[PDB]
Design a protein around this ligand. Structure first.
Ligand code: CA
Ligand code: CA
Ligand code: CA
Ligand code: CA
Ligand code: CA
Ligand code: CA
Ligand code: CA
Ligand code: CA
Ligand code: CA
Ligand code: CA
Lengths: 5, 627, 627, 5
């Protein structure tokens, strides 16, 4: 759960 | 306006609606002079020559009790000519289509501002319906009595003779261009007007009668919809079975559909959101503590609903819609559609909580559509122009290229069509994630304009570390207190020329926005606080926080949830926390530093990014603005 | 605005664009007081305390000859402290993006009116291309040197050091939301910006350079397009091979796309259209005679191209577009798409003749989309509000029902988006055909406002026939002179109570529009002439002309082509022609009565319906209006 | 060729 993808 | 043609051959019959202008044409069908005599109920303002420029206007005081119960006799005459009469039989009626046009208390133009006029219509986008999924405005029924509280009252007041609707009929209508945006119900509820029904014959008894309608809007102002809806009543003469109906009178009400409005960090918080049911509970303890301190409801989205999506900031923005009769919160659901996809629809939409979404929902989207990239300034006056609900702020690139991102145009256009918070594009695309909340925040302040703009500032942090080194602490360790991390000394941070180059470029990106915000929000330096913050460039030279991004904070009135930076410990305390405290405590702000390192920071976001807040709507009424 | 941070540790280098505001931050990185010394080319307005509220602004007089050829030395000092210098090396440049913003002679806001500002852009919708079919703006090439006459000139003037673009680059760009509406060519032509190219790196040499661009618009203002196009130049610092480009400066030009504008009957005629190559040649002789008298070009569409479609009025409307550099006529091609379908595209569009169309092209259309239902008033001032190009007029129903017609919404929205002639809906749907030209026309007049509104009037004709009967001519025959027609006596016309009922209802429909036109166009009775005209109701109680509809006339300055009514012949002359002459001749109008009976009248139209006219554009410039 | 259809 990266903020970016 | 009406011009009645009177004739000595035939007596004429006519209806007069009170409040209308009625003139007579005396000349066109005359047989040298004329006189006029009428019954007491008719006031005739205008003995006279039979000359075309003689304006004869009839005014009627009250509604007729019987048809033709008022009369006008025009006697024509001449030197050698005994008088010749023409008869006009009048029936007066009252036809008032009424709405809350003064905007407190239930021309044909909608005008903005405190001296303006025009009723307000809410988009009926919540779900009062008990165990349902749809927004209330999706069907053509009023299914709950409380749903009507969201709708706008319109009333038709009529006063006629007992037999008047034998030969006349009233029709209520909406232009086909607008019928898809409104639905109108008649109360005693059943639909009279709506998406496939632009007109409806009203069933109205003679004498005095009052008919209430309830109106819901079905769409927000947008590119394709300025936000105005006109409903018209027409009185039709149906006296002749061998002729079409003839319009006798029309009157209208113009409604404006209430815009979607956002709330800045300076608005008092009401409810905090986190979906902190995933791996870690101490983050969640801290925000829960802050919510309590701030007197807020607290709602949490569990791992089973999260799908491991921890970015509560990004999938939604809680705004509101506002009318004199009703104000409700409304969630704008971002198209980003990750693990939190269902949360706005299933958990946030409900009774007195509206819903809106925009943009393509199965692809065609970027990171700048995440609502960490959607914020709003406090109220601001810019070179005389007042923005009493602030200005929406969202991040962009400085120019469009093959490798640049933007928020989807459908979102941009929807925000600008809610004219009320006149959006300002900022430059966020230099960031990996790409969100304005990575370099700015606003906090309340007791003096001067009532807020401070906080900006992330590499300058401030280099200054801090240099002073610390100058005072003999060059050995002090950034990342003291972290299990699994390369500790780094102040002296080596300062001597790193590539890190310095990176942060110099970032400083330049932030300074561009500083001046942009200064122009567009009318700010002086005294409105702005720099928060010490290092960055680094990584993939595609995109910027990321070097240590926990402190500007990405949760603002709960005077209570702040600031990411714990884990800075060099000097005289028993992290010098970064210390610096931030020295900047914010003088404003009355209480700074809580929250460990988010391995749960948020490491995954490219901080406290603001992992939370969301519903805040109190502005007291100032949007319709009193002059956009 | 730019804020340069000066430092005693490192000398700073910066570019300054002339006309920009440059401030220094002296305090943030200072080591009690300071002084400033600069080279003659720098004017420093602001000896001084080292206090944060000291505003230090730098101004540069001319462009630099070499990079860093201007200097600023800030010497800091104190009681016991020998001076410490900080160095700032400045390079001044000129970057002017120029357009015709004063609207005669080649802020960042487009404002309306004589004191306003903002350049104009034409939709490049004609076809200068020699033997081609497409509009010129459909490809991405300038194919003819004269095409450039339609385009707007924009110039980039730059003055820099000889080596300046070693480390800086200029980019020209347009927002992705607008790139589909504009195309920009660089001249020495090749496209730099357009539908798939929102940005382009300019190749610019150091020193002094001037680069011309030519800009064409690709779309008219519409529901989805307010009509503004912004083109921006950005100066980028590309000095660092290990860092992204950084924006140093942006400047913009805002263009407004010129609206489509119609011409009233009071505008002098330039060219007459008929497609009178079908069965009959004497109609055509008469209009040809009138065109000659009126000094007009005359063009005729032959039977082979007609496909037996004789209604030249209905398939098109000739308007114009206007900029300070170029004005051209532009055909709005109606979606009605009958036999004349190809005429606008093949015969009217061409060199310096533009094209536009709207609405669905293979169905979904009504009779009110025929351009006999599209007209425009003369210039008019309505309760103080000036409409210097008049107001568009088109016919509608009074309310939407299952059996009512309207002009397609796409057409309506396009007309209103050309804000300039603020459309007014009239009520034409009571007519079988359904066109405003069946009950109104405008003619020039030498006095009072400069025109008369003519309205068809059953009242006038009953009056005429009654007077004739009163004078002993009750036996006189309507339709004297017609081969195959039931002749009818004045006495029997008058005694026909059903005909009277029909015309009474029609009178009511026309009177509704009279008062509507009075309100919306600010007319008095003295602006209006009633033309004697009978009607009858037929299929669906829809109105048709009883005898040739004289208001449906061709207006060629003072020369009028009026349908020959074939009225009762009294003292050697048709009393209808006589009545019309008595009404219009006092205005200086010459009335030619044209036999159209078996060719037009019998097929539900008259002279206006069988012809079309191109008229001179208004001298008044649309951009000087305040809509 | 009626004007109407
Ligand atoms: Ca409902
Ligand atoms: Ca509701
Ligand atoms: Ca979503
Ligand atoms: Ca509700
Ligand atoms: Ca947000
Ligand atoms: Ca071309
Ligand atoms: Ca061209
Ligand atoms: Ca066509
Ligand atoms: Ca041309
Ligand atoms: Ca026309």
């Amino acid at each position: 759960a990266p903020r970016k993808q | 306006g009406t011009l009645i043609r009177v004739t000595p051959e035939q007596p004429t019959h006519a209806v007069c609606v009170l409040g209308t202008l009625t003139q007579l044409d005396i000349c066109s069908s005359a047989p040298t002079s004329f006189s006029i005599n009428a019954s007491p109920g008719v006031v005739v303002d205008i003995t006279w020559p039979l000359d075309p420029g003689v304006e004869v206007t009839l005014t009627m005081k009250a509604a007729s009790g019987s048809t033709g119960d008022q009369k006008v006799q025009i006697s024509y005459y001449g030197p050698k000519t005994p008088p010749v009469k023409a008869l006009l039989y009048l029936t007066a009626v009252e036809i008032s289509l009424c709405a809350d046009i003064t905007r407190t208390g239930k021309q044909r133009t909608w005008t903005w501002g405190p001296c303006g006029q025009g009723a307000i219509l809410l988009v009926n986008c919540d779900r009062d319906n008990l165990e349902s999924s749809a927004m209330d405005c999706e069907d053509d029924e009023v299914l709950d009595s409380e749903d009507l509280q969201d709708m706008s009252l319109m009333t038709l007041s009529t006063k006629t003779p007992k037999d008047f609707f034998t030969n006349h009929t009233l029709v209520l209508h909406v232009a086909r261009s607008e019928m898809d945006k409104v639905r109108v119900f008649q109360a005693t509820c059943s639909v009279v007007l709506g998406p496939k029904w632009p007109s409806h014959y009203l069933m109205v008894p003679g004498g005095k009668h009052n008919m209430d309608f309830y109106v819901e809007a079905l769409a927000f102002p947008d590119t394709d919809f300025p936000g105005l809806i006109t409903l018209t009543i027409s009185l039709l003469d149906t006296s002749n079975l061998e002729l079409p109906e003839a319009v006798v009178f029309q009157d209208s009400v113009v409604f404006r559909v209430a815009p979607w409005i956002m709330t800045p960090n300076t608005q008092p918080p009401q409810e905090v959101y986190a979906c902190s049911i995933f791996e870690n509970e101490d983050f969640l303890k801290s925000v829960t503590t802050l919510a309590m301190k701030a007197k807020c409801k607290l709602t949490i989205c569990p791992e089973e609903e999260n799908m491991d999506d921890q970015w509560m900031q990004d999938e939604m923005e809680i705004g509101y819609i506002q009318a004199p009769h009703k104000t409700l919160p409304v969630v704008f659901d971002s198209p980003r559609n990750r693990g939190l996809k269902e949360f706005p629809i299933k958990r946030v939409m409900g009774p007195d909580f509206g819903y809106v979404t925009r943009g393509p929902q199965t692809g065609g989207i970027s990171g700048l559509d995440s609502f960490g990239n959607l914020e709003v300034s406090p109220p601001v006056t810019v070179r005389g122009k007042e923005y009493p609900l602030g200005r929406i702020l969202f991040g962009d690139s400085c120019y469009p290229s093959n490798d640049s991102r933007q928020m989807h145009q459908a979102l941009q256009d929807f925000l600008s069509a809610q004219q009320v918070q006149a959006p300002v594009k900022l430059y966020s695309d230099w960031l990996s994630v790409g969100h304005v909340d990575e370099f700015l925040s606003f906090v309340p302040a007791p003096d001067r304009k009532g807020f401070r703009l906080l900006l992330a500032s590499p300058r401030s942090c280099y200054k801090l570390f240099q002073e610390q080194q100058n005072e003999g602490h060059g050995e002090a360790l950034l990342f003291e207190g972290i299990k699994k991390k390369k500790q780094q000394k102040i002296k080596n941070i300062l001597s790193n020329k590539t890190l310095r180059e990176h942060n110099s470029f970032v400083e330049r990106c932030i300074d561009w926005n500083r001046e942009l915000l200064k122009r567009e929000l009318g700010l002086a330096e005294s409105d702005i606080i720099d928060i010490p913050q290092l960055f680094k460039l990584k993939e595609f030279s995109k910027a990321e926080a070097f240590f926990p991004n402190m500007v990405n904070m949760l603002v709960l009135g005077k209570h702040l949830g600031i990411p714990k930076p884990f800075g060099p410990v000097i005289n028993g305390r992290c010098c970064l926390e210390e610096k931030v405290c020295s900047l914010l405590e003088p404003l009355g702000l209480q700074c809580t530093f929250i460990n988010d390192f391995f749960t948020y920071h490491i995954r490219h976001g901080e406290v603001h990014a992992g939370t969301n807040v519903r805040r109190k709507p502005f007291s100032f009424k949007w319709w009193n603005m002059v956009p």
